[PDB]
Amino acid sequence: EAPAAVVTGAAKRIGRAIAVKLHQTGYRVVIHYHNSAEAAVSLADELNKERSNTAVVCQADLTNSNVLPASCEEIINSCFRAFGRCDVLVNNASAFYPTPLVQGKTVETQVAELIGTNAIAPFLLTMSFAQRQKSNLSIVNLCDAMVDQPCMAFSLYNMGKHALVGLTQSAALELAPYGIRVNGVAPGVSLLPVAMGEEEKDKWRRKVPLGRREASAEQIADAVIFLVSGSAQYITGSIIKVDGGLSLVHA
Amino acid sequence: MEAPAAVVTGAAKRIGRAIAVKLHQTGYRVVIHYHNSAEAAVSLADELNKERSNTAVVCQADLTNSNVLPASCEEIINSCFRAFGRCDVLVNNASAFYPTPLVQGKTVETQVAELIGTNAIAPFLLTMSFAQRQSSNLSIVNLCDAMVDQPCMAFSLYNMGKHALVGLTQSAALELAPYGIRVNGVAPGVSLLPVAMGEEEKDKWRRKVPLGRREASAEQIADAVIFLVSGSAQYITGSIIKVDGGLSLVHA
Amino acid sequence: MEAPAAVVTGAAKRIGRAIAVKLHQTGYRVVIHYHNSAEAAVSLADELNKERSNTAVVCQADLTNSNVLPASCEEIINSCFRAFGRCDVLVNNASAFYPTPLVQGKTVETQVAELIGTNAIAPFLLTMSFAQRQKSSNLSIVNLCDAMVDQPCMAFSLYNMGKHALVGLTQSAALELAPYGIRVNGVAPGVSLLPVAMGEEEKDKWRRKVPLGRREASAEQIADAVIFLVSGSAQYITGSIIKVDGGLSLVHA
Amino acid sequence: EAPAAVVTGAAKRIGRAIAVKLHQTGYRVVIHYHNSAEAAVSLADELNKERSNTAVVCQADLTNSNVLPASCEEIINSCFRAFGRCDVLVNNASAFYPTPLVQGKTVETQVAELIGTNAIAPFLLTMSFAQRQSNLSIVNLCDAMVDQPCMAFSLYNMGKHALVGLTQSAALELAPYGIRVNGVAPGVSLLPVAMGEEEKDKWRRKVPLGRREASAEQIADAVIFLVSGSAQYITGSIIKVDGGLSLVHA
Ligand SMILES: NC(=O)c1ccc[n+]([C@@H]2O[C@H](COP(=O)([O-])OP(=O)(O)OC[C@H]3O[C@@H](n4cnc5c(N)ncnc54)[C@H](OP(=O)(O)O)[C@@H]3O)[C@@H](O)[C@H]2O)c1
Numbered sequence A: 001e002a003p004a005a006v007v008t009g010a011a012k013r014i015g016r017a018i019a020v021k022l023h024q025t026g027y028r029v030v031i032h033y034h035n036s037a038e039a040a041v042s043l044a045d046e047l048n049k050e051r052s053n054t055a056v057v058c059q060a061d062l063t064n065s066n067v068l069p070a071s072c073e074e075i076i077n078s079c080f081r082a083f084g085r086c087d088v089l090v091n092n093a094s095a096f097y098p099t100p101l102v103q104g105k106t107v108e109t110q111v112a113e114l115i116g117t118n119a120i121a122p123f124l125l126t127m128s129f130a131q132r133q134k135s136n137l138s139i140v141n142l143c144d145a146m147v148d149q150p151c152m153a154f155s156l157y158n159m160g161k162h163a164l165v166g167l168t169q170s171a172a173l174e175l176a177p178y179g180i181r182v183n184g185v186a187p188g189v190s191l192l193p194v195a196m197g198e199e200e201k202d203k204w205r206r207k208v209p210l211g212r213r214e215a216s217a218e219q220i221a222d223a224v225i226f227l228v229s230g231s232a233q234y235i236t237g238s239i240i241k242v243d244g245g246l247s248l249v250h251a
Numbered sequence B: 001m002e003a004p005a006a007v008v009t010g011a012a013k014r015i016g017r018a019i020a021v022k023l024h025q026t027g028y029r030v031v032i033h034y035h036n037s038a039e040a041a042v043s044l045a046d047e048l049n050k051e052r053s054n055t056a057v058v059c060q061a062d063l064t065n066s067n068v069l070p071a072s073c074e075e076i077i078n079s080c081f082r083a084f085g086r087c088d089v090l091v092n093n094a095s096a097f098y099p100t101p102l103v104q105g106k107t108v109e110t111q112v113a114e115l116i117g118t119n120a121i122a123p124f125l126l127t128m129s130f131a132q133r134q135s136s137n138l139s140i141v142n143l144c145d146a147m148v149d150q151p152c153m154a155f156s157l158y159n160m161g162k163h164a165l166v167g168l169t170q171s172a173a174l175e176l177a178p179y180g181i182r183v184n185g186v187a188p189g190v191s192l193l194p195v196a197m198g199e200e201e202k203d204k205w206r207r208k209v210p211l212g213r214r215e216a217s218a219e220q221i222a223d224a225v226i227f228l229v230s231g232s233a234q235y236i237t238g239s240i241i242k243v244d245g246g247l248s249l250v251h252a
Numbered sequence C: 001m002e003a004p005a006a007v008v009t010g011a012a013k014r015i016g017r018a019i020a021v022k023l024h025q026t027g028y029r030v031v032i033h034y035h036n037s038a039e040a041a042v043s044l045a046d047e048l049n050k051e052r053s054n055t056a057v058v059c060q061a062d063l064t065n066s067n068v069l070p071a072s073c074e075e076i077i078n079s080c081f082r083a084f085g086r087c088d089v090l091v092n093n094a095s096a097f098y099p100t101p102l103v104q105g106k107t108v109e110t111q112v113a114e115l116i117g118t119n120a121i122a123p124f125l126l127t128m129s130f131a132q133r134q135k136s137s138n139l140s141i142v143n144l145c146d147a148m149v150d151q152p153c154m155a156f157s158l159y160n161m162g163k164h165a166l167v168g169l170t171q172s173a174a175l176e177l178a179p180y181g182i183r184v185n186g187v188a189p190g191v192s193l194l195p196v197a198m199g200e201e202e203k204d205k206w207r208r209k210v211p212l213g214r215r216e217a218s219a220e221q222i223a224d225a226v227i228f229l230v231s232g233s234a235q236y237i238t239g240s241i242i243k244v245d246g247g248l249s250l251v252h253a
Numbered sequence D: 001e002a003p004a005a006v007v008t009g010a011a012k013r014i015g016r017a018i019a020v021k022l023h024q025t026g027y028r029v030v031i032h033y034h035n036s037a038e039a040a041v042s043l044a045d046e047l048n049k050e051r052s053n054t055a056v057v058c059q060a061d062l063t064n065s066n067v068l069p070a071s072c073e074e075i076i077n078s079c080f081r082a083f084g085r086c087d088v089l090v091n092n093a094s095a096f097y098p099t100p101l102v103q104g105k106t107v108e109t110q111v112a113e114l115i116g117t118n119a120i121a122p123f124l125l126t127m128s129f130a131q132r133q134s135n136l137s138i139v140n141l142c143d144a145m146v147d148q149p150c151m152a153f154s155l156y157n158m159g160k161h162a163l164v165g166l167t168q169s170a171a172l173e174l175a176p177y178g179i180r181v182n183g184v185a186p187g188v189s190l191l192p193v194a195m196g197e198e199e200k201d202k203w204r205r206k207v208p209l210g211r212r213e214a215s216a217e218q219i220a221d222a223v224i225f226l227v228s229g230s231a232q233y234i235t236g237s238i239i240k241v242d243g244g245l246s247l248v249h250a
């Protein structure tokens, strides 16, 4: 029987490339999405045309609130309802926008989005994933290779991604006895934000030593595929940078 | 109005009390923030005001994450400006610490609001308030944890909160540097052990520490805070000083 | 000449042997570098050449630091171009590992030459020789690092200095060689094959500390991360070190 | 009664500032130098004019070689001969120049100089300090930028990473003897004499806190803290003194 994976924020960009590649490797996939319902259903349709009954969608807002734990329970439950099993969780969904310390949404909305999506939802998904266990079980967290050299005015985003490093280590430690590995993939610059102009995109591109270009979504997905694979069966608590050398470049 | 002034969160007992005492001894006026420890906070302010009149005030606030945390953090900073006319130093010391197992009577969302609210979100909001309200020597010191990469079993949310606080330390150092506000951390290993911890378990930890097989005093933690706020650290920002007796170098 | 070629140092036994086997399985021709283990090196080359003729050679060299180490490292890279007409991958695996207490029959200058030469200087000189030779391709270097260098064994200062220096080489060489398309990465085992000396009970002390399975990594599990880093699946990865340590480095004292 | 300190490469720049501030704190000092004989004797004269019999100079080459161990033993012995004790070792001397991987010193000389001064000599000085043994400690001058290194400085960067390794390993091993071992990691402090003014300003503009390099005295302040009674539970720590430079992305 084919294993099953949940990918959060899988309708577009990097999470889509991860779900496509897990699907190409033989997984059945839950395509989680928040707002991108058309893109989500479309991808599931494509994957189901390739092999029948192998993809479902699941809608959830991963903002922090008193119902986030139930929404995280439901995402995991949807994998067991569809596939009877849940072998892999990829924490990919993320909010990303500036929160300047010196002066739009209220500050507690910014905290709920940037800490909720980037850190607390991964924690609750990890709890739900682990508790539902009755094989090569793992979790991969999408981290950020530049968290020690952050973008100016992104403190809450940075705080959430440092927290996700902490979860990666703490959950690896705690879930090792259950045979669940927990690792991360840390892109530098990959698919640039859609709102970004080409000129600004090129400023970032020119900083990358290996090829002066951003990672493709497939290149990020390749490292996720490695970490879920049997070739990573002794790896837990590791974060693999996939950044073309960007984090080595001084100011 | 010539003496500088400091806010210390969770200043009634243990490490925050030692910090407040040592800043006061260095010549600071101090705000002693407390949540539940009113009697101890006031007892410390009485002690400091006897030494030097009108140099210590108390400020009550809960630092749990909520819709009101922003107002509570604004009020802590405001209380320093009201009392003393200025606020030179913020010490983010208050902290919740307890296990949160992944495989399982506070709701999980309450555990979040305390372990992430109190240890990371409150420092972030206090930082925004402190910065907004600004030969000055302005700085923030965050109480971090030297064992963040080799954490205690079943302490995920606490670990998450202390990693978030490293992220705040670095991001705020970068962004506030133009304002001349330095932002640094002090990372204890084992210092005063939790009051709830058993004696045998305390000794198990002390035996691990390379440097003298004992925990740090609160005053040893405070000494690193005093260095970082001083004129001898005026080029230091974004730095976290471990004060752990070598504990974090010891393999399993 | 369509098959790529790889140099693996210290490849006669244990982890380097497993790396040379997996690279060969992947379609690489291999130079099996050895120092003292000639019989084991030759035996591996004969096994590999039985599988596919003319795909494995051995190369003997001492990688201790000295006046002649630069010429030795140049000769190891040259051996790969003479055997196979190309050198696509260098794996810096050879290593000396023994205690060097700070407080009290090798002299300390011999200890320095062996521990810093094998773990750090020889990798640097091999890296220089590999790059100088390179002026469809997927050129990369993988350095065998150590996941425990921040929580080191007592009295191993020179060993730990050499492995920290190797992290620095991995980063500096990644940045400097990225314009030539040469990626430079590391694999950091925690406990893998335990040193031949140790008795089952002492091996068992270390095994019991590993969260993931309470056992050491096989040599092949370490090799698997090397295979990933040299592969087309890692073509944007440079300057990275992959721990393969079962969670050991997360475990407090 | 006054404690004594060895500072390597103490004739000029940051090591000089460290020697001065230790002396101002009450220490007797060995001013180690290699080539800067006039500047070393001149500083010793200035310190002894302030307090007689409190400064000596000691000449040694800290390039790696089969005689480096004897030179490092001699530097520690010079402190005991002058002052009868040695409480503090500051590993400050350092070669710094590029060593490109792709192409008038031989590569074997560049390895001996950059790995010997930045790493091997500190190790042997540590061994000699420990063996010859109050608030004993060693401070290693590290580099805040070693994970974001200058292009073509691989051997320098290898030496400074090795010095982090030594700081940790010796802190662990010497803790039972009460010897603390810590580091201070400048970002940009006093820029190299040979560097042109235009390049100096390029580096200054990158520093978030003040858009200026650290003074030698600001670096020495962090050394004074780590040797002080206010750092008695600190060992294996490296303090960055870099004005935020290491936080700044490309
Ligand atoms: N892209 C890069 O250069 C880069 C660099 C470093 C790290 N990363 C990390 O790599 C991962 C993938 O990057 P990306 O560029 O593909 O991410 P992205 O496009 O910014 O976000 C991916 C998805 O996250 C989901 N999301 C956002 N807010 C949400 C909420 N409140 N609830 C539920 N879902 C939410 C969205 O789903 P809907 O569209 O369905 O609403 C969005 O499409 C992220 O974790 C990111 O931080 C990326």
Ligand SMILES: NC(=O)c1ccc[n+]([C@@H]2O[C@H](COP(=O)([O-])OP(=O)(O)OC[C@H]3O[C@@H](n4cnc5c(N)ncnc54)[C@H](OP(=O)(O)O)[C@@H]3O)[C@@H](O)[C@H]2O)c1
Binding pocket: B009, B010, B011, B012, B013, B014, B015, B016, B033, B034, B035, B036, B037, B038, B061, B062, B063, B064, B092, B093, B094, B095, B096, B097, B114, B118, B143, B144, B145, B146, B187, B188, B189, B190, B191, B192, B193, B194
């Ligand atoms: N003790 C150690 O060995 C050690 C080790 C590593 C790191 N640290 C760090 O060092 C710092 C000080 O440690 P410590 O042992 O002195 O801390 P602690 O005793 O656990 O807590 C300090 C104070 O924090 C306040 N606090 C807790 N929850 C709060 C909430 N919801 N709102 C407002 N205040 C709250 C409490 O004040 P009230 O009493 O007024 O309610 C408490 O007295 C902490 O940040 C800690 O994580 C300590």
Ligand SMILES: NC(=O)c1ccc[n+]([C@@H]2O[C@H](COP(=O)([O-])OP(=O)(O)OC[C@H]3O[C@@H](n4cnc5c(N)ncnc54)[C@H](OP(=O)(O)O)[C@@H]3O)[C@@H](O)[C@H]2O)c1
Binding pocket: C009, C010, C011, C012, C013, C014, C015, C016, C033, C034, C035, C036, C037, C038, C061, C062, C063, C064, C092, C093, C094, C095, C096, C097, C114, C118, C144, C145, C146, C147, C188, C189, C190, C191, C192, C193, C194, C195
């Ligand atoms: N095994 C582990 O648990 C572990 C843990 C952490 C890191 N690592 C790292 O992973 C790599 C492989 O580990 P391993 O256990 O397989 O290594 P190993 O057996 O200790 O050493 C590998 C080979 O290194 C060669 N070597 C030693 N000194 C040499 C010199 N002076 N000149 C030339 N070659 C020399 C020897 O070759 P000859 O036999 O031909 O003389 C030896 O067989 C090493 O870099 C090690 O530091 C291993």
Ligand SMILES: NC(=O)c1ccc[n+]([C@@H]2O[C@H](COP(=O)([O-])OP(=O)(O)OC[C@H]3O[C@@H](n4cnc5c(N)ncnc54)[C@H](OP(=O)(O)O)[C@@H]3O)[C@@H](O)[C@H]2O)c1
Binding pocket: D008, D009, D010, D011, D012, D013, D014, D015, D032, D033, D034, D035, D036, D037, D060, D061, D062, D063, D091, D092, D093, D094, D095, D096, D113, D117, D141, D142, D143, D144, D185, D186, D187, D188, D189, D190, D191, D192
């Ligand atoms: N300046 C900065 O911006 C900066 C930045 C990062 C880290 N650091 C570190 O901080 C420390 C002090 O910096 P600095 O700029 O003051 O250093 P420096 O001026 O470059 O060097 C200090 C002294 O080291 C001695 N030295 C060099 N080669 C030697 C050899 N073969 N044998 C013995 N001594 C030798 C020289 O002594 P003589 O003059 O007597 O020959 C030299 O004056 C160094 O460890 C450096 O790596 C400095």
Ligand SMILES: Nc1nc2ccc(SC(F)(F)F)cc2s1
Binding pocket: A094, A095, A096, A144, A151, A188, A189, A190, A191, A192, A193, A204
């Ligand atoms: N959720 C998301 N996180 C990031 C982080 C960095 C980047 S690349 C950039 F914008 F240059 F920093 C894009 C995204 S989208």
Ligand SMILES: Nc1nc2ccc(SC(F)(F)F)cc2s1
Binding pocket: B094, B095, B096, B097, B145, B152, B189, B190, B191, B192, B193, B194, B205
């Ligand atoms: N708020 C607090 N945080 C910590 C972290 C560690 C410790 S020492 C211990 F408990 F051994 F890990 C005590 C406290 S109290």
Ligand SMILES: Nc1nc2ccc(SC(F)(F)F)cc2s1
Binding pocket: C094, C095, C096, C097, C146, C153, C190, C191, C192, C193, C194, C195, C206
């Ligand atoms: N060359 C070598 N390096 C190491 C490092 C660790 C280990 S595992 C051990 F010994 F438990 F630390 C074996 C070796 S063999």
Ligand SMILES: Nc1nc2ccc(SC(F)(F)F)cc2s1
Binding pocket: D094, D095, D096, D143, D150, D187, D188, D189, D190, D191, D192, D203
């Ligand atoms: N021995 C020495 N090491 C360094 C490291 C950096 C610097 S600052 C510079 F050069 F901008 F990198 C000067 C020196 S002098």
